[PDB]
Design a protein around this nucleic acid. Structure first.
Lengths: 106, 206
RNA sequence: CGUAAAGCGCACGCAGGCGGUUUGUUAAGUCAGAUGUGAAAUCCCCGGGCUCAACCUGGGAACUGCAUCUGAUACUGGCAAGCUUGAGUCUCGUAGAGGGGGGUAGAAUUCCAGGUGUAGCGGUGAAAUGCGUAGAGAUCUGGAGGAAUACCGGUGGCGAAGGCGGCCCCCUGGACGAAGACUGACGCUCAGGUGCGAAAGCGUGGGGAGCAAACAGGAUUAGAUACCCUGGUAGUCCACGCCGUAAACGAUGUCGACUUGGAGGUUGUGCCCUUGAGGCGUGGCUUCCGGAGCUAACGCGUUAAGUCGACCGCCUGGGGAGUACGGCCGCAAGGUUAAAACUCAAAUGAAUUGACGGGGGCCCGCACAAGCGGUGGAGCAUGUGGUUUAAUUCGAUGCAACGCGAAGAACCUUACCUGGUCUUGACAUCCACGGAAGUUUUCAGAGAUGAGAAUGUGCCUUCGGGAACCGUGAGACAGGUGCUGCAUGGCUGUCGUCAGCUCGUGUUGUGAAAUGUUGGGUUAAGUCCCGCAACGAGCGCAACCCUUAUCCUUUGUUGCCAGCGGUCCGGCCGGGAACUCAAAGGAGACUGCCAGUGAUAAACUGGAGGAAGGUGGGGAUGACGUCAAGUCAUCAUGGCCCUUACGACCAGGGCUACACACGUGCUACAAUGGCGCAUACAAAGAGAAGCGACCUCGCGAGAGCAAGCGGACCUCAUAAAGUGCGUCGUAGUCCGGAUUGGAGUCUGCAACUCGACUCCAUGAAGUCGGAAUCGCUAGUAAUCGUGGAUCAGAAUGCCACGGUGAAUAC
């Protein structure tokens, strides 16, 4: 797209291909540079994202969930009783988690 | 019975003709029958040589037969006595001064005549058909071959009812006319009767 | 034991089984030990003897038991005393279609009497039977009578179940709640037993409005002992007695205990600013959904089908059969209890995939509708069935066989029939001998077999032969359009150019399988977007291909002639390369632009430009599979079969037969036409053993001489409907041309069976086609000609080409 043959040979198919990059970019966004299957999983809602918890339990991945009072501690290895749908709560919450991730041995 | 021959619908598009002489109506039938005799002879007498195509062309009262084969050495032989023998008898058949050439088909598992002749030979050495077909698809997909489909048919394994059981791997776009589909067909005369082997090999999209 | 077989229809309750909690005593059950016995053999264990083994045998263990004595006292039981958490009593209220008896009220139906009024009413899919000018139906008034009780009315209530619905009174049962008091385990279940028990039915006596088995009539129908219509008796209603059953069903026995939740309904009640349509609790009954758990699954899920305990009932493959016999009950109908012989290898439950539905939703196609023209009627052509025959060769048979294989049967083709003939053969390969082959002759016969004359050496061989060809002999074989398409390949039809068919990985389910592929839009299209336990991929759709519609570039003959010059006025010539055109190469059309609607998405609707506008028109292209569809007779092919014959050669015949029936076409029935004369405008093709000008002859089919052309040059070859004149005049006619007689031409050895065409004569049937049926959505249908393949000659068929050119689609 941004380097090679994007204007080449068609306008319509080029538009088709670019919106394939919008669809594959927003669905496979963050995971595109992973290259493995990850060593942990941090979900922000346990009932809304039950599929990912079910798979990480299927594969032996530690699930870290902020459950709410409607959710279920399925196979969430590290449950956190919180609030899933408040933006203040999830920005505070992910702020703390992203704060503690970016301390490795450094 | 319903599919077009995938060589014939591509004759002006991508595939060429195996006879490329011009002739008026007086000698069109005679040239054509002379081609049936030289392909009949030259197909029978090179059964071991793994021959793919034989292309006839007639530049001004002389034939120019080109044998696309996989084993050119067994066609030529120790200093090419077999070639000069073959052009002697092709000159006997066609009645014109004959030339003859040999084009080496490298990658012989991508040529459908050689694949169908292979599977046919294995079926008349009484091996099980799923090995022959499945090995043919695997080793053909191994080298290039953007698709391949093989299809044996008829009283397979010596049954009393006839099945087909085709296999395919990759993409074989058979309604696409710019597809370079190399299709060919053989018959295996076994002790239970004829077993038909068709094989389509998709090589490229233009 | 909800649905597979299996929960009594529901209760009350005796005998039976089981029984909260504390203390004391007993010690019956229970436990421990001891003693007596439990015969021997046998089984088991450790040894011993037969050479081993079986066998025999020594000692033990065992004989799971019973009796007695000695103890233990936790549990169960007995006895005595208690205790309240089970059960029950009392006080006060609450809600209720709980029951039984009696009364009353209002709407409505029917009937009766009367007023008005007049031709229908009623009924049905349509009708008719029925009621009605003796006055119906409609309408108003008055009366009688019977049954049921609209609205409230609610997965609301009450009841053990059956069941109970206006309102009021009387007699009466239960439930639940609040606080307190009392009894003190009084409890739970229950075989036999007893009671209650819808509806229909039965008995006696009433009642009888509506409704309605039976019944009758009318229809419907092939029939209609039915459904529908019009009537209509028992019955339904009351009193008393019987019956004793139901899909008497939550297909779920009763009682008790425990085990996450949510939303309601209904009926109590306490507390707290009530300061709402308050808040917070605590009971009883009940509805829906769901968690764990259970379940074959479906589902159940604190009202369990979960986790337990007590007692009862019942089950043991389907049928026979809940039947027969017997008993008991019953007035009867029947109820209850309850087999067997024989017979089958299944019967069954739940769920899955599909198919189907006179199930539902959405959608398409000349599918219907809207139209135009046909077919079925007539004559002929051609194919088929049948019949005939010596043979009428074989194959194709709903759609998808029936001018199909066959793109062309006189002989040939030909496979069939009748005769005449041949046997290593007509067609092969390999031998051995002889001779070059070949070429013109004659006789016999239907051809090949026989009898002769020349020509024979086409090139090499210590010669014994080879190249080519022909006879002869033995073979191994050759040959088979013989059988099996249900043993096959290959090729084909068809559903259907319908939009579908799948796979990998993942997930869900025990599993068959599911998802993806479904859902909201959209599309011609599983097209495309959006969503989504799916993520992707393949075959298919689309595109790439051919053609057609516009423009540009190149080249310009044989093709073209705008501008030029003269012209025998014809592109005819010099010439011109503009134009038509030819053929090669490009441009072009993609929802590209605009407006609006739409999830700001897909897209749809409309507009501009453009030759063309939304897959522009047409074609090619036909997914996985279905029909054990077609072909063994194109070919190939497994097996079977004939191999002096089912193989081969020949002549004549047949495939063309004709009481009949069907399919597909052509020509007609006419005036939108027939005939005569003149005259205009095509496209696409074919052509050397061929197309065959010009000119002469023939009325014509054609004949003679014969140019030109292997071909944008010559020939086939004049397009015809059209138009302009004249005539015919509604007639079986100047329609129609079948049929038949005569005379011919051509092809071909040969037109008798059995060609095509011409000329003269003849001149049927037919006046628009019964039931029914078919094609077509625009250069289409309709109609008019032309060409080609097969082919010596033989098309009304097939495949192509152009001319004129519609109607209609709500």
């Amino acid at each position: 797209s941004q380097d090679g043959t994007f204007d080449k040979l068609t306008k319509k198919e080029a538009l088709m291909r670019t919106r394939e990059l919008e669809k594959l970019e927003n669905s496979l966004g963050g995971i595109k540079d992973m290259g493995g299957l990850p060593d942990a999983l941090f979900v922000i809602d346990a009932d809304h994202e039950h599929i990912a918890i079910k798979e990480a339990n299927n594969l032996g991945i530690p699930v870290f969930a902020i459950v709410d009072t409607n959710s279920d501690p399925d196979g969430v290895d590290f449950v956190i009783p919180g609030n899933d749908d408040a933006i203040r709560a999830v920005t505070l919450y992910l702020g703390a988690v992203a704060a503690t991730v970016r301390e490795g041995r450094s | 019975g319903q599919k077009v021959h995938p060589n014939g619908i591509r004759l002006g598009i991508v595939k060429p003709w195996n006879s490329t002489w011009f002739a008026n109506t007086k000698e069109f039938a005679d040239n054509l029958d002379s081609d049936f005799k030289v392909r009949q002879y030259l197909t029978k007498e090179l059964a071991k040589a793994s021959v793919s195509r034989i292309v006839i062309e007639r530049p001004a009262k002389s034939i120019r037969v080109t044998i696309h084969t996989a084993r050119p050495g067994i066609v030529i032989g120790k200093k090419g006595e077999d070639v000069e023998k073959l052009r002697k008898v092709v000159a006997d058949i066609a009645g014109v001064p004959a030339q003859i050439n040999i084009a080496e088909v490298r990658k012989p598992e991508l040529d459908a005549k050689l694949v169908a002749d292979s599977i046919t030979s294995q079926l008349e050495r009484r091996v099980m058909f799923r090995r022959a077909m499945k090995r043919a698809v695997q080793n053909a997909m191994r080298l290039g071959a953007k698709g391949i489909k093989v299809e044996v048919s008829g009283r397979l394994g010596g049954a009393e009812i006839a099945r087909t059981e085709w296999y395919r791997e990759g993409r074989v776009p058979l309604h696409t006319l710019r597809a370079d589909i190399d299709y060919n067909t053989s018959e295996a005369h076994t002790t239970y009767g004829v077993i038909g082997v068709k094989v389509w090999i998709f090589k490229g999209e233009i």
